[PDB]
């Protein structure tokens, strides 16, 4: 039963989705490495915000 | 000429820091910091902290954390700025709607919600097969 | 919101804020201690 060309349509279009896909999670990886960028940019003022922080008696 | 360090951080990373002979401040009220002042708290105001090395930071809004060897100032935003403050706006404006233009980030996002759905249009299986 | 743990692993949490962690200026600390908290989150 079914096609022949309507299964290499079906190939093709899942293939262009896997594409689509995989682009993005790189794209999301290369996001993940810059919010350490943005994290670590903001380790210093919380440090220095609990060391301020330090609650009188 | 013994030296006090010097550290300004902000929620976007250091921004100026370096050994010198004094930090003058304007907390709430100047108050003039040199190395061997005792610990001490206070917050500041929205004006610019004078470091003096050879002689002569833009701040708005946070503390001060005085160390006999160190001082911090903690800043919600700071640009090593001229004399005006009304610059530090300046750069919270240059930066502000060029923030906004960041709409390529909700954009890209769209084109490839598009790609997604047009893989997925010729229903990437018909009734299976 | 969702914390961090190692590259893709996380969980939800509720960590709660605003109560229980010149002189006294907490008109200050108050204000600078929740924009920081609502930042890290």
């Given at each position: 039963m079914a096609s022949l060309r309507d299964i290499k349509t079906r190939i093709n279009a899942t293939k262009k989705t896997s594409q689509i896909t995989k682009a993005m999670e790189m794209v999301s990886t290369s996001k993940l490495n810059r919010a350490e960028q943005n994290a670590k940019s903001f380790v210093p003022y919380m440090e220095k915000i609990q060391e301020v922080v330090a609650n009188v008696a | 000429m013994k030296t006090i360090h010097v550290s300004v951080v902000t929620p976007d990373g250091p921004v100026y820091e370096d050994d010198v002979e004094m930090v003058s401040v304007k907390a709430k009220s100047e108050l003039g910091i040199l190395p061997?002042?005792?610990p001490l708290v206070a917050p500041l105001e929205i004006s610019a902290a004078r470091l003096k090395k050879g002689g002569k930071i833009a701040v708005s809004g946070g503390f001060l954390e005085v160390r006999p060897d160190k001082v911090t100032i903690l800043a919600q935003a700071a640009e090593r700025?001229?004399?005006?403050?009304?610059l530090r706006a300046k750069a919270a404006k240059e930066r502000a709607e060029r923030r906004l233009q960041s709409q390529q980030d909700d954009i890209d996002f769209k084109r490839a919600e598009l790609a997604l759905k047009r893989a997925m249009?010729?229903?990437?299986v018909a009734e299976m097969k | 919101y969702n914390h961090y743990v190692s590259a893709i692993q996380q969980e939800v949490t509720e960590?709660?804020?605003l109560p229980l962690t010149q002189e006294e200026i907490l008109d200050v600390l108050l204000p600078q201690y929740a924009e920081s908290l609502i930042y890290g989150a």
């Open positions: - | 061997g002042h005792i700025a001229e004399d005006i403050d009304v249009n010729r229903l990437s | 960590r709660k804020l």
